[PDB]
Every structure is written in C-alpha cells, then in structure tokens.
From TrEMBL, chain A:
It is found in: Mitochondrion. This is Large ribosomal subunit protein uL29m. Belongs to the universal ribosomal protein uL29 family. It comes from Trypanosoma brucei brucei (strain 927/4 GUTat10.1).
TrEMBL record, chain B:
It comes from the Eukaryota. It comes from Trypanosoma brucei gambiense (strain MHOM/CI/86/DAL972). This is Uncharacterized protein.
UniProtKB/TrEMBL annotation, chain D:
This is Uncharacterized protein. It comes from Trypanosoma brucei brucei (strain 927/4 GUTat10.1). Belongs to the bacterial ribosomal protein bL20 family.
TrEMBL record, chain F:
It comes from Trypanosoma brucei gambiense (strain MHOM/CI/86/DAL972). This is KOW domain-containing protein. Belongs to the universal ribosomal protein uL24 family. The chain holds residues 1 to 162 of 378 of the full protein.
Amino acid sequence: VDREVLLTGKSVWECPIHIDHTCGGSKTVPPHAKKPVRYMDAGIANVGVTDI
Amino acid sequence: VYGGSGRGDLLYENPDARRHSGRALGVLNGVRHSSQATMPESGQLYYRKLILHSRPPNGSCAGLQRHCHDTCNWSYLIPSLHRCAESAISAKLWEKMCQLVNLTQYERQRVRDGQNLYRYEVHQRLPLLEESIGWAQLDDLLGWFRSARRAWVRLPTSSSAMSCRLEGHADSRDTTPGRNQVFDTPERVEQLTEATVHRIREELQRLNSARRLARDEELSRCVEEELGWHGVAL
Amino acid sequence: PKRKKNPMQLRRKVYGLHFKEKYLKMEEWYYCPLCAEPKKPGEWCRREDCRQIKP
Amino acid sequence: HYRAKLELDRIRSMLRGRARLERKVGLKRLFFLMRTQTRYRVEQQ
Amino acid sequence: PRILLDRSLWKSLWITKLQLPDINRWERVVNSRRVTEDRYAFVEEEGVMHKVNWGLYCERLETELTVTQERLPQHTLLMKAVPSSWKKLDIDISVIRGLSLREAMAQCKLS
Amino acid sequence: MYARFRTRSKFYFRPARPALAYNVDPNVMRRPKVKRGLLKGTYSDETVDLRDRERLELLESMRHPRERDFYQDHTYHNQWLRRDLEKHQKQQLAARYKYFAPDFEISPWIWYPGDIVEVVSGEGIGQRGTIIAVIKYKNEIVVQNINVQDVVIPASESRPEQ
Amino acid sequence: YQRGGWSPGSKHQKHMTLNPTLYLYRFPGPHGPGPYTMKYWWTLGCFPTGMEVPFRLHEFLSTYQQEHVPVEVEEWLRCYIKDPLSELVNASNDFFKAVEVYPEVESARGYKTLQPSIAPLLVPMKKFEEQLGVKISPVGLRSVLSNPVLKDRFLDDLFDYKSYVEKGGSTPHRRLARSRFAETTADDERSLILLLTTISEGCINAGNYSDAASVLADALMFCHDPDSQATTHANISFASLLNADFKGAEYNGREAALLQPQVKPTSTACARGYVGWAAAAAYQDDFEKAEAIVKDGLTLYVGNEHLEKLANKLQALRPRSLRESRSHLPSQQSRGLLSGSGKGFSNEFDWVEFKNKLYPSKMDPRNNEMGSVFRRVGDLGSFISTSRSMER
RNA sequence: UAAUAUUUGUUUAAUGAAAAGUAUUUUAUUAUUAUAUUGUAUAGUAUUAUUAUAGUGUAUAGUUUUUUAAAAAUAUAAAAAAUAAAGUAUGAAUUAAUAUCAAAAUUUUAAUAAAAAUUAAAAAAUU
RNA sequence: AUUUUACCAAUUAAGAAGAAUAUUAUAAUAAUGGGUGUCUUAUAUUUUAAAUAAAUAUUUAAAUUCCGUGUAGUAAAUUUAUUAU
Ligand SMILES: [Mg+2]
Ligand SMILES: [Zn+2]
C-alpha cells in the first residue's frame, strides 16, 4: 500500500490493516470489563495549561 | 607535514593535537628517549620529525609502493575549482542569478558562502597552480575564468571577494615556516590572472573539416565574453 | 606445548626450506603449442593431438 | 596499588613485538627495565 | 535541565536522527533560548583562521577524495566473505605479490 | 624459496574496536563528515560480497568437495515453534514501523488536502505549497512540489527501467 | 571442565553436566555471519539450527515491493517514455562536449606517460551507446584518444554525426519504423560507420582483437551501401584473424569478395577480402586452397601488393588429422590463459556443467568411469543389462 | 597448542521392522462391500553416534556413498605377510608469567636448584 | 648474468533507524485462581480448624538458667496506608 500510494498519489485515511495492540491479549480479558472510576487523581494534566 | 596535511590538500589537519580520533593517546609511535613518557618535548623540530614521519600514509599521502595522484596538472585543478562552484550554488539558483537583488535570505548566505569557500581553496591550490601554467592547456586556461564566474566571483585585475586581505595583526599572524600560506593573495592572484591571459593569447596565436571551423568560431567567441565578465580584454 | 609461543617462534618456521619449498615457490611453465594453455613440462592433456605427440 | 601504567603505556614503541602489542606484558617489561636502570645508575655506573 | 539543548542527553541515548535534525545546522544557547546557527569549520587561510560553511566543506572533501581515488589508472576489487582462513590465504597470497597479471593468473592456475 | 613471506603480527593479536558509551562518538561535534575509509586511504571499485545470493555458485565453486555440510533440507530443531527474533532486527522493525504503536494517529487532525502550507523545518524550509494527499495513519503529508525525489520503476517483460 | 567461556561460541573445552547446551549444528559466529550459514540461508530457507527466525523483510522491500506497480499506472507509463530523436541529439551533444575537452597526452622522453583516465567519458558514452544501440569499447576509445590522428577522425566524425542528426532524421530509426510497418546508406550513417571503424582501428592498436571484431558487427549492421559492406566485411575478416576466429574470418572474408561486381573500381576492399579468406584458409593449414585463392586474386586483380606479399610469403612457406592443431598466434594464448583447465580447478575433475547446473565429477552425466555414480546403478529390477558377473 | 589430531564415501545379501511419542505428503490413495468417526513414510542414548531394543512372519530382489606412489615403531595375523605416516581440503583438545633464550661444567646459598658467581662454548629447519 | 644479500615495523575515529511506548526504585483508589488458535456435559469442577503472619510493632529501668532475653494507649473509626498504565 505504501508503494501503491506513492505511485497513484491517492490519500489514505484509515490504516489498511487492523492492529491489535495487545497482541491477542485482549481476548484474554473478559468481555464485560471496564476500568473503575478513579477519584482525585494525582496529576497536573486536568488543569489545562498551555504556557508552562 | 608529511602525514596530516600536504601542499595542495583541502584539509586543515592539526598534526600535534589529535582532534579526529575516538581514543586517548595510548602509544606514541616515534619516540627517541624513554623520557618521552612524561615530557615528550614535541613541538621541537627534531622530535616532531620523528613523530610525524612515523605516521601511516593516508589517502592524501599515497605512500611509496602505492601509485599517487596527478595533482599538479592544471587540467585537474581547474575542474576541481569548478566542482566547488556547483557545490554552494545550485543550477536553479545559478539561473536566477544569471538573469540579474531579490533573493531568499537563506539563499543569499549560500552565495556569500560560495564566495568564501572559493577564496579559500583558491588559496590552497595556487601554489600548485603557479607551478603548472607552463604546460596548462587551452580549455583549462579558460576554465579559470569559467569557474570564477560560476562561483559568482570577479577576479582582481585592478561581486568580488578576492581583493581584500583577511584582517589580523602581523605580530599575531602565523608565520611558521613549512606551512604554505601565501600572505598576499590579491597580489598573487592578480598576477596569476594576468599570466593566464597572456598565455591564452600565446595558444590562440598557436592555434591559427567543419570541426575546427565551428570550434574556432565558438571558443574565440567564448574568450571575449568570459574575459569580458572579469573586465579583461584580449 | 608448555608455554605460549611469541611472534618470533611463529616466525621461525618460515626461515626453513621445507616451508619455502612447500608454500612460497613459483612454478616453471610455457605455452602448450597445441592448446595454448599454460603447461608444466611432463604433464599433458586429454586431446588426441596431445597424446601421440605430447608437447 | 600504583604501578605507573598510564605513563609507561606511552613508551611501548621501544619494545619489540610481544611487548609492544599486548599491554600488561609491555608494562612489566618497562617497569623491570626502569627499576633495573635506576638501581644500576645509583650504585654502579 | 532548565534548558535542554537538542543534541544533549537527558534520560536518553545517542539517537542521532533525533538528536540533530540537521547535521549542517548547529544549536547553541543564546539569551536563554535555543538559537540555531550555521555550523562552521575553522580553516587556516592567510595565517589567521577563517570560518567556512561546514556542510559544503565536508561534502567537498569527500567529493575530492572520491575523485582523486577514481581518476587514478588502477582498478581495486574487494571480495568479501572469501571461504578460506586468514593464515592459509595469506600464505597463498604472498606468492603473487608484485607479479604481472599474466604470471599471476598462470601461477594461480598451476597450483 | 623465491617468494618472500614474513608473518603479519595482526593475526597474532586482534583486539576488538572500542565500543561507544551511550552511542556517543565523542568527536562527532568536532571532526568533519568525511568517510573514515577515504581519509584512511581505503577505496574500492567493486565490493563483491559472497554472502549475496547471486554470487552463491562461485562461493561453492571455490570450496573443496571433501568438506561436507549436513542438514541441507531438514533441521535438528523443529522450526515451527514461535520464538522471538534477535534484538537488533526487532529494533529495525520498531524504527521502521512506528505507526503500529497505540495512538500514533494525531488528535483532532487538521490537515486536509487543498490547504496552503509552509515548511517550517528541515529541507525546503520556507516553501509554500498545497496539500495534495494525506496519509493519515502514518502522520504524513504530501505537499505540492516539495520533497520531490526519483522513483525507480523496474524492468519487466515489456518495459525498461524508468 | 570449563577451560573456556560459558557462551555457546567460546573457544575451549566444555562439559555437558556443567555447561549444558543443545545441539547447534552451524551456529553463526560473533561477528559477520559467514558464507556457510548464508549458503544455508539462500538454499534451505533458514540457518541450519532452526533457532534463527528467518527474517527477510529487508529484501522484500528490495525486490517485491519495488516491482509492485499497479496496472492503472503501468498502462500509462509507456505513453510518457522519452523522445528518442531528442535523446540521440542530447547524447551526441554531451558525449562530443565531453570528448572535446579530453587533454592532449603529454609526450615524455625516456619513459611512457600514463594517459589520463577516461572516467568522465563513460557516463555520456553509456547513454549514447544504447540510445544508438551499439556497444563501444572503452579501451578502443582511450587508444583513439591517444593518437592525434585517430582523435581527429573520431572528433570530426562525431561532429558530422551530430549535425546530420540535428538537421536530418535518424536513419536507423527511419528504417526501423519502415521495416515492421532498401535505400543507400544516408549521411549520418556514413558518419557513424566511419567513427565506429575509427574506434575499432584504435581498439586494434591496443591489442584487444575480440572486442575490435565485436564492435564492427554493429558497424556492418548500420551499412546498406555495398562499398561500405565490402570494406566492413574485409575489416571484420582481419579483426577476426587476429582474434583467431578462423570460421569468422573465412566467413566474412568471402562476402567482401562477393561484392566485387557492384563495388566501385576505386576500392581496395574486395582484394582485402581475398587476403583474409586466403589467410584464414592458410591458418587452418590448408595451404593448397590458400594458394588457389591467392591465385584467384592475382587472376582477377592482376598484381596486388598484399597479394604480392601473400603470394610470395605462401611461396616461401611452400596430414588431415593434425590440421589446425597448432597455436600460431598470441591472442589465443591470451584466451588460453583464461578459460583453461588448471591443476585442481576448471578441469573435468572438479565440477562439471550439466544444463547450467554444477555437479561433482562423481555425478558426471557424460562419464561412467570409476568412482562415477552410474557404475553403482544396478539393473533396476527389469532385465539384465550386461553379462558382468560380479559388479552390475 | 595448530602448516596438529580427527575426517576423509571406488561397489550392497541392513530380508524384516508394530515398542519411535518432533520431520508442511498442495489431492499419498478403493476400484469398496460396505455403512458414522478417527489415524498410516527418516530424529532412543546432547549427533545423520559403537549402532539400537523386541513381537510378528518368511530363504537365491547381490535390496548399490569409504580417500592415498617407499622405510622405522605401534595394532592383527602368519623376525616375513596384511594395515597406517611428505600428502590437496576441513580443522578441534590438553597447555600457555615471561625477555629472540636458557646448551656444558664447578662450587656456594635456609631443602632438586633452569638462583647466584666463574669458566665456558649452545647456528636454522624437519623427523 | 637467470638474481637488487639474509634479517628487522606498527596499530587503526565507526559506514549507516542496527538500541527506546527501554532497566531499577517510585502511584497507598482495582483485584474470586490471566490464557488468545476460544465454544454441551459436571454422577467426575469442595479446603474448611482460636497459635508468628503474604496482617511485619515510637526509649537505655526493673526482674529472670548471673553471662544474647528486654519499653508498655496516644488519642477512643484519626489522617501509616499493600498502592500500579
Ligand atoms: Mg551500534
Ligand atoms: Zn595440449
């Protein structure tokens, strides 16, 4: 697809392949799983800060 | 002066201090006395003889058994000077400059960088250029003007960078013997240019099918327009 | 061996005539007048010229 | 212990093959030589 | 670090494409900012030391080295991963040094 | 007895070249960009590597028939187990393939074809162009007549190399 | 136990109960992995141990990704190929410009001067040659650029070819176009055969005869004039005589003869053809036919200074099984230095050629001598092949 | 150590083979008389090891990979005989503080003393 | 001439996506035994028991086979507490 896009010049939006970032490990996790709600986390990121 | 930087080379190689290496100075090869360990006394002529002449031959040196380059030929040196011109100044750029200052700032610096470098390596090659005008050839006498033109440098006959001397006070300047550095460049380039004009007319007097007809039309045409750009006639 | 030999002991073997005769020796040859190959005198080729008259 | 490796490492050029090639061998050779000549110079020559 | 120059190291390695975006360009700290100048090489000219543009200087050096190696009347062949030993091959080489191509090929053919 | 061979002392002692600390070659910022082989005096016209595929038959024409090499079509260990690559080709994979990482796509993606755009850093700096095509998953942009290089289209039955 | 490292590459003795390792047949070493494991890499698909995961990505990008080009693109690419007329013009121009600036060789005294290499000249000429369709000697080119006379001819013939290709059309392209969908040799083509003969003439002075003979083939390819054909065939006769191509000389020797009616009276060509035909006959040891041919030459051409020379030389010189055995000239000695059978290699006992594959001399499909595999073949359970009692 | 040892593929009665727990059969394959389902070829001892273990069942498929141009001594057999050593190719292992080496004799020194001192007279290579 | 004696020498800057969701400690909010190429069935899928423990404690005195053993609520649910892509 790299070669073909380099030739034809078409724009490509979505990746031509699916990437499973867990390397097949997400199937090990039960289907109903969701992360818990964490309160009062440590971090500076939720303060949106542009200049520091 | 043997191993590191020759007569007509373009390197600046500092023989006494090793600035290109990847490792501390472990074993000093030329050594005379065992007192060279803690106080080598390099910098004395008689010990740097022994050190520098024990260095392995470089790509610059071309040691004895190996066949060396024909450098002092004018016919090598002129296209050498010419390949410096296409370095700083690109073809496109050249065209835009040929037309006629509106130029990208970034771009401008390349022109003055061309001028700078060309000045330098003219300084390097002229001790080999002054050797060779004698057997130099009709094309590459003309190349001297072509290459200066392409690098956008006007040659001093009395834009131009070749006229002024680099500033520094004569007490502070480096006068050390054995390093070939000509202190008057604009005075010895000028009388190089005059010489190489005078030799050209010799060979055009010497040179007097359709091949010779067209050739003798064309190069005679190239003389007045190339020498004319540097302000020289005939 | 009871000890490591230095470059000199390694270099001692090349002074010998056995070494020189075995390894660094040039062969004498001429051109086979029938085959034009380089040839040592006394060794021939399988070719019907070179069997009867063996040049 | 100070054996003066880092000064004598610069001398090796005056030693023949096995000593000038490999470091420790050469350093032993130079340590021996210089101690010997020192001793000799002070008491005999 | 209160000012991180890009060619320097912090929790990092020498990743050279990341460290220096442009090899020709040179990065330094000026007036508490990252300020980026053109790299120069110091070269002796008239006995003073003059600054020349580094990039074209270097590429010119390698240019002339390649061309002085090239326009020479020789041919240098390098053969790699030869399937012999070092000692044996050195032995078999030392016969052939300083010979005509004719005698070289003949002595190679006859052993 | 007519040739002259004195044993070279390098085969007796071959210490490895000193390895770099943090890959930092201490003098990069000092010395030129000249290839060290060139300044050393090393040059070659052809480099013929016998580990290449094409050269393979003369690699087998120079060896002796007496030396056997076993396991030509089979292998002592079963090759159908998944076992990982050696590490530096894993590094090649990673450096070549960065866009396989999670969230490599840039958040609320702005660049769409047709926009007029300056090149801020690197080569072609200060050049305005129009976005021709967008390769989104790589975070890459094709800009009109900027970064134009050659593409080699190989020979085949009917065509030459273009 | 353990007089060496704990690595599975390390030098000295190990023991199994202390330093257990599994059986690695050929384990690629610490540095470069060598030609042996690579032999295995290119034949059976991986390294012989089966622990090294075959990773070929770096050549997939080299061969298969590069040739990918889709149909929609490659259906349009040949509509964009360069104009060959223009390419011939440009090639001729810059080749000539590059040849004109070649420095005149300085003549030293007491020692021969090394000619300046033609490095910059290979680049224009390699474009020019296959824009034209004829391969040209580098050696012959340099030798032509040595002699001032040859350089003169080469230069002005290049100039004429240039001018004729700019003002006129390209005649071989004309007669290539009119062929698939007859006339005397055109101006440009005359220029071309002239410069190719010049460069072959230079190719001979340096003593590359095979190449000089190979250059002139295309030279006759471009000549439709019977005068040109006669001269060129003659020239190839001589250039294949020096190459010891005797069937080639005794082929091309007689066409140059066959053209004698329709070639002008002002030609030396046909006589040269006689000389070559005769000389080739002479070199193969048939002297009678040689003298017969020179007799014919002096019959038809009366006195001829080359046929004088060859009649009296033959005269001075004056079994079928032993003919053309002798090695009479040095170029086949040169060709015998290469391509010969030496002790231990390139003989019939090392590797034998079969259908473009290498074999050991044990399986030699043209030979059943002792040690050969085909002696062990048996009778294959059908009929008894030979009356041999014990073996086979 | 190591221009070393080893290897070295010019003629087969290993007939057979379930107990091997590894080896991309691309469709290995019935024509059945039988029904569904399932499954057929080379890795025991770290090896393509000295060479397997055991149960079938049978006797004319020769059922088809072992280098080499002298002699000592070692190994068999009858100091004779058979075998093996300059060889092209592959290429390990024990050992290694050493200076280009350390040869001969005499005494001494805290126990051989290649430690001293003195006289002396050890060339190189190969076996 | 057929032939330029025998012997005697080093120590290398490094050509390059062939070193990063990298190693180690650090997060006092989750936590029935993680298993993807998985997928009827559970007669055959049971781990419980008052103790020193996946729960780990702010002094030098006294006294005890005289000679190796020793500090008690700090606040009563109070903020030393087994955290984590
Ligand atoms: Mg690296
Ligand atoms: Zn022959």
